[PDB]
Design a protein around this nucleic acid. Structure first.
Length: 48
DNA sequence: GGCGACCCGGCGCCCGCTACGGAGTCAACTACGGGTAGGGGGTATCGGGCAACGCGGCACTGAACACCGTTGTCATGTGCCTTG
């Protein structure tokens, strides 16, 4: 049910310093095993 | 005697979040007096447990009439035979 419900629902990833407005960026969530957030390498450098 | 430095006070702040330890500490006293509060003791008041007894449909009570149906019944009318 969780896999069914999360889709098409944004979540705002945000890093602590949030120096500039790209510190908060919406994303499409996606269930994944493990316990660490998977993030796209391209958007990393915007978050520093 | 307002300028003047200087002096001093006095104040103002001092990136972000999660997540990440515990620790807890030194010097009066008694007497009274009330009042509240507790306890048990006893008492008026409210709440819980049962068969008749309210109902109603219908049903029986058929009893007592009613509704046709029937073969009871009668006094009174045709057809043949005997006599005018």
């Amino acid at each position: 049910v969780l896999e069914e419900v999360i889709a098409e629902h944004p979540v705002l990833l945000n890093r602590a310093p949030t120096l500039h407005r790209l510190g908060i960026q919406a994303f499409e969530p996606q269930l994944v095993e493990g316990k660490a957030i998977q993030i796209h390498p391209l958007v990393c450098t915007a978050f520093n």
